[PDB]
């Protein structure tokens, strides 16, 4: 799910409170479509609502579908609201709080998002951007290894409970480590920013369980998204619960902090992209990956056969058997294609499309092999003496919604096993009434 889908399902009060922070308004604005952004900018300095027809006349007739989609999205996000214009007309005006906060974030005003940074002076134990990136990568690899279950990764029990609630891994027997399900494999195959966003959404959906303010967490996350890389910020000025949440971020590698009591924290590149190549693919079904970490090697080996492992290179061959095994593990072909496209080497970016069509088509065809046969358990009826009697029973089954397949030519029909009892009673009752 995207950010807009999550925001649209929130209550109007939550949306109104979210707009109170300038950082949140910018994040919402940058998620809007291109047409919506122009409307927002035009209505930035309007103190009066505009007629719906007047706004509708800005876009041409052919692009009316996009206009309707953008208007519906804006209404769902509650950026603007309909006003009863005098004379029976309907006026459209942006939310005053959201508009004011957006203007403050753009034009200026109020206090800065962060409290201050020069009060404590220079950092005694400051790091560098490559060091922060390495720390974030190490944390993410540790998390993904703990998803696999290797003993090399040791995380807090709360993280394991969160993963269990996320459905990636289930602890059937207490004490023993949880077993990763098919959804866990699908999530592991997902891209790193996508994995971060999914994890954050799962956290937010269960945020109320810990008694934490959703609005504050969202505002802090959006503020972190727009933060400048390599620059620290003051921990002070935040509620304790948020601080606890920040600790979880320290576990996830999004935010670097030397000590729990330290007043400084350095956002990482992963945190920046939270709001939103080394693999070469050849026409002979060969992958040449410029990677060294065991994570990428395992990910590639999930859907391909490894051949050679040079110290800075991995040569693998994509075969039918490997792709079939990966699909049987629960990973779909679209996920594999998206993973290959995301990790595509910059050299392949010249090609249009980046991945050769033959390989993607072959992978999709290999995916279609598994679902060649379709299975539907049910009960077969073939003892219809009269067409009219068959029609009535078929209509009753369709009313019950338990029909699976019908053949009026030969008076043949199939119903679900659960609905067989109702059909049997109905057929017996009709004969009794006869």
């Amino acid at each position: 799910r995207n950010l807009q889908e999550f925001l649209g399902g929130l209550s109007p009060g939550v949306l109104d409170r979210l707009y109170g922070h300038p950082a949140t308004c910018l994040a919402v604005f940058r998620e809007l479509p291109s047409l919506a952004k122009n409307w927002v900018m035009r209505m930035l300095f309007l103190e009066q609502p505009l007629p719906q027809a007047a706004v509708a006349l800005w876009v041409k007739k052919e692009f009316s579908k996009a206009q309707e989609e953008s208007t519906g999205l804006l209404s769902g996000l509650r950026i603007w609201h309909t006003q009863l214009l005098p004379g029976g007309l309907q006026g459209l005006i942006l939310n005053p709080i959201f508009r004011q906060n957006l203007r403050i974030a753009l034009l200026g005003g109020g206090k800065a998002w962060s409290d201050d940074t020069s009060q404590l002076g220079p950092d005694k134990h400051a790091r560098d951007v490559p060091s922060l990136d390495k720390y974030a990568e190490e944390r993410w690899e540790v998390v993904l290894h703990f998803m696999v279950g290797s003993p090399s990764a040791a995380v807090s029990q709360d993280l394991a409970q969160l993963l269990s609630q996320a459905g990636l891994m289930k602890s059937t027997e207490p004490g023993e480590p949880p077993c990763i399900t098919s959804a866990g494999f699908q999530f592991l195959l997902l891209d790193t920013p996508a994995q971060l966003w999914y994890f954050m959404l799962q956290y937010l959906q269960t945020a109320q369980s810990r008694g934490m303010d959703l609005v504050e967490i969202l505002s802090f996350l959006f503020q972190l998204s727009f933060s400048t890389l390599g620059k620290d910020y003051s921990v002070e000025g935040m509620s304790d619960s948020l601080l606890n949440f920040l600790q979880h971020l320290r576990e996830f590698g999004l935010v670097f902090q030397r000590k729990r009591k330290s007043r400084r924290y350095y956002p990482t590149r992963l945190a920046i992209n939270l709001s939103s190549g080394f693999i070469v693919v050849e026409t002979n079904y060969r992958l040449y990956a410029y990677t060294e970490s065991e994570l990428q090697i395992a990910l590639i080996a999930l859907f391909s056969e490894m051949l050679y492992r040079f110290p800075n290179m991995v040569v693998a061959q994509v075969t039918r058997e490997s792709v079939q095994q990966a699909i049987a593990s629960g990973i779909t072909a679209q996920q594999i294609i998206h993973f290959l496209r995301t990790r595509a080497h910059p050299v392949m970016l010249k090609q249009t499309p980046v991945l050769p069509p033959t390989i993607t088509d072959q992978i999709r065809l290999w995916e279609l092999e598994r679902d060649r046969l379709r299975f539907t358990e049910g009960v077969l009826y073939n003892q219809f003496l009269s067409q009219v009697d068959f029609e009535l029973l078929l209509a009753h089954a369709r009313e019950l919604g338990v029909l699976v397949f019908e053949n009026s030519a030969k008076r043949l029909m199939v119903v679900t096993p659960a609905g067989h009892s109702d059909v049997k009673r109905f057929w017996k009752r009709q004969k009794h009434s006869s």
Partner: protein
């Protein structure tokens, strides 16, 4: 993967702004600079990958101008303010030159766009447009260079948008018509920012969706070689295609070419 580059050329001719200040009108150069900065901030807000460049033209040369608000915008606005203050404070009138060096700024903008294009990753296309705000009168002495710049922009498929404030410029109209850009004259100067956000802010694909004012009556008057003045009817050589205001027994250009 849609990358939009906005290069804003600001007519910083000191004479026109000084006359405007003496008029004690509701519009000043400071308000124009603020509107340009707000437009740039909005352009950067439109998309993450959007890139902004600001060039100010002066009688001397072209200057590359590039708490509660965005951090990158805060840095960008401060640099632009410092650059414009440095340009205006050190702007000394030394000579009889008064026309704005608009052509040189456009050439620098084209060079900058060409430089930025190569740095773009091959998987993405950098759609680039040039926005020009005109305050002083048009200069006919740079007709050939202006036409060369227009042709280069058309060859590289770069939109050129002109925002005339007081006096209409035929060269800007020709540039907008040839490059497919928008030419607009501001009726009310204080409302400049609203016009910029309503018209020039959206990209070309968005311009297809939106309804925009029709183009103004673009002129195509040529410039005589020996007069450098707009003319309606003139003599044109059949060899070098040079244009002359009066008939001559020998072509001056063809005389030069041996």
């Amino acid at each position: 993967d849609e990358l939009n580059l906005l290069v804003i050329v600001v007519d910083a001719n000191p004479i026109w702004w000084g006359k405007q200040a003496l008029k004690e009108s509701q519009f000043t150069l400071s308000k124009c600079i603020d509107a340009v900065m707000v437009l740039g901030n909005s352009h950067l807000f439109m998309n993450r990958s959007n890139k902004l460049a600001v060039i100010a033209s002066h009688i001397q040369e072209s200057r590359f101008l590039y708490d509660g608000k965005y951090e990158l915008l805060t840095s960008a606005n401060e640099v632009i303010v410092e650059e414009i203050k440095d340009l205006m404070t050190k702007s000394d009138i030394k000579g009889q030159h008064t026309e704005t060096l608009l052509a040189g700024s456009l050439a620098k903008a084209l060079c900058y766009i060409h430089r930025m294009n190569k740095e773009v990753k091959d998987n993405q296309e950098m759609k680039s447009r040039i926005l020009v705000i005109k305050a002083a009168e048009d200069s006919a002495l740079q007709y050939m260079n202006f036409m060369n710049v227009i042709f280069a922009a058309q060859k590289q498929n770069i939109l050129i948008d002109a925002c005339v404030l007081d006096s209409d410029s035929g060269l800007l109209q020709q540039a907008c018509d040839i490059t497919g850009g928008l030419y607009l004259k501001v009726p009310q100067m204080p409302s400049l920012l609203q016009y910029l956000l309503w018209v020039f802010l959206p990209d070309q694909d968005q311009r297809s969706q939106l309804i925009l004012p029709p183009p103004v009556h673009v002129d195509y008057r040529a410039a005589c070689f020996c007069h450098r003045n707009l003319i309606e009817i003139g003599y044109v050589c059949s060899v070098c295609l040079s244009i002359f205001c009066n008939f001559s027994p020998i072509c001056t250009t063809c005389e030069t070419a041996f």
